[model samples]
Target: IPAFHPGELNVYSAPGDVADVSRALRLTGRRVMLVPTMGALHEGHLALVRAAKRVPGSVVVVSIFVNPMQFGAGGDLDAYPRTPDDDLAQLRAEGVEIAFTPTTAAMYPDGLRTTVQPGPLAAELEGGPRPTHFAGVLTVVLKLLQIVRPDRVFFGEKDYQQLVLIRQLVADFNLDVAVVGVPTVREADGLAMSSRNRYLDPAQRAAAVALSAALTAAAHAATAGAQAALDAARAVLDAAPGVAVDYLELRDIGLGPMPLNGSGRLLVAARLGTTRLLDNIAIEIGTF
Candidate 1:
């Protein structure tokens, strides 16, 4: 842990070192708000902090640890961009009072044996593609929940499926914290803001919009037919060069295969060049 300086951003490397946070929790008329991140600090990420500010809180703690357990073998774990300094600068600018940037070792101490197993909601959509993704996600999220015990937490709706799964984790585990979902921030061209988007080249960026366009196209035709949604999506991506489809699934908001009742999401993960892009949209589908 670095030496603490007053008025500057209070950074914590270990849970025990967070003295200011403890006092806030124990003190009267005070509330803690948390915004967890991977430390790229884009506009979308700042939006989460801004969302936290609106919620009731006195101290805002942003966790910026890149959880290794979430990245699968052959996944882009090593390739994921890391920018801790920029992240801290943005948090400081956003008036974030506390930031927790735990090392992988600090987070997973020696002989750590427990992990949160995400159930059905995690086994599909993003989970199916990355089998252990949700387990790792839930584990770290729960750990942060325990460490901060924030009254309210802010999450971007870009990871809508992940957002739903975390909500389920809190509900099923009976954790005492409010999970608030902020709307997905987007580029001028409609691509959802993601840390991985930085991997796209000029041509790849242009081609990437097909993912969102697919959702937009299918969204308008969701009431037409089951295949209508997927067909329209494929129609755009099929002709584009270097746009390889991975998975495009339409499911209930919970990421289930059950029949949707006017509300559902269209999720797609595909490769443009060598980079994989993920995006989804909340859509209306009328059932007969």
Candidate 2:
């Protein structure tokens, strides 16, 4: 009920303090799991935390820093949601052990001159749209892994590309952390939970429902051996009023651009009014 019940939730505003808190927790010989987030926590995020808590000796650490480096020019850097007070309250309700809230400067003191590129895989899909996004993501994630040094990390599969890249980064760099992917959490009507969804107006909100609908349609079409699920999904968005399709593709689960050849991921992005939304579902051709 209270904003943050002391014993259940611990909030750290400074990056240095987070390291100390994490170090102290590790010294207890307990296995810890970290859930990195950009604030505006939703049920999808809580799902990651809940999954982390299921591990033995697990203490869930939720980081709420929105890394500015991940936002490109004309992107939603300035408009990204932030409800720090409510976020902390939600974490408290979820029984999170530590909340890492780092400042932009704290996360990137030298202004992020260096970055971690995940090679060709990083150059496609979401990368083609927001060129420098994943580089910033990998850089910050590596920094966080170094800071927290948690035994495991939790990420939602909604950001399918990001989840794949983080996993690759860990493997390539030989980082000693296990990366886990949680299923995307969707609204009862199927819209994926995203912080940006808050920007939608009444009409835009209703129109935004088309994203999930399109994803579902694509999946259904794939089962019928339709090789053009991408076009089918796009047609759904085109019919919606005031919706602009950004990129709609049916690719492998790794976010790699693949032909409509059997199993893949159906990803779609669009804008209704000023709100941008993305949704995806795994598809297997000829199988319902």
Candidate 3:
């Protein structure tokens, strides 16, 4: 493993610096792979970087920008953790080729008068509560796609809906890139690794395990039936003292209503204090 070093990594704060290299690569018919983030890098995030390197001919680029537009009215724009020094260290340790740590001004010089409109899917699950979220996500991601313009982009399955939406965004606009989905990386106890997991206290941390347990229990019961699957997950959350359920649904992979006969995703969003956590698992109507 390479030790984290400043001079060893090629990092840029301005998009132009990154774009200059990216444009050069494309002009020379070289491939680049992008791994976008909101800083606070974790194993789950670094896991995507590993995936990017696996792509043939790719020069992996990771961007660390905490977009203000994505944070809702009462969202954690102010409170959301920003640790560039630590984030950069991790990126370099992971052997990321190039990094873009853009400023809010760089990303939104126009002050966001217009945002990409996410369709009806934006009104469901995560988007249901945070109305402005998907729009902000689409907008920033579109900009990143334009700025980095990689041959392939990597996303984590932990943010399953976001991954789907980004795929839709690229397809709809005919962006020339591949959106790759990486599986969720979990903690020792099965809690999905998230930057927000830092918000959990000692007790709340234990309670958070209920989310993954619920999803697993639900998937197990899915052999019985869909409603039974929902009940299995609901029972887990109902018994969890500190974790409050926001929504526990079994929806299609695209976040739409579940198919009658096929397998779909079981998604959950719950609160432990003010920190809302989300997780999902694939569940089928048929076999165990």
Best by lDDT: 3
- Residue-level lDDT of model 2, residues 73-179, one tens digit each, is 64578777789999999988888878988888887778868778767777777788778888989999999999889999999989988898998899989999999
lDDT of 3 by residue, 1-288 (tens): 112233356878888888888888678676889998998888999899999977777688898888899988644788888888998898778777688889999888889887899878887778887898999999999999998899899999999989989989999989999889999999999899999999999999999999999999989898889989999999999999788898888887776544645768888999999889999898888786
lDDT of 3: 0.87
> Which of the two, 1 or 3, has more lDDT?
3
The lDDT values for all models are 0.82, 0.83, 0.87
How well is each residue in 145-257 modelled by candidate 1, as lDDT tens digits?
A: 88878888888888988899899999999998999999888899889998889998999998888888888888887778657877987797786668998988877777655
User: Where does candidate 2 stray beyond 4 Å?
Assistant: 1-7, 226-228, 257-261
Leading candidate by TM-score: 3
Candidates sorted by TM-score, best first: 3, 1, 2
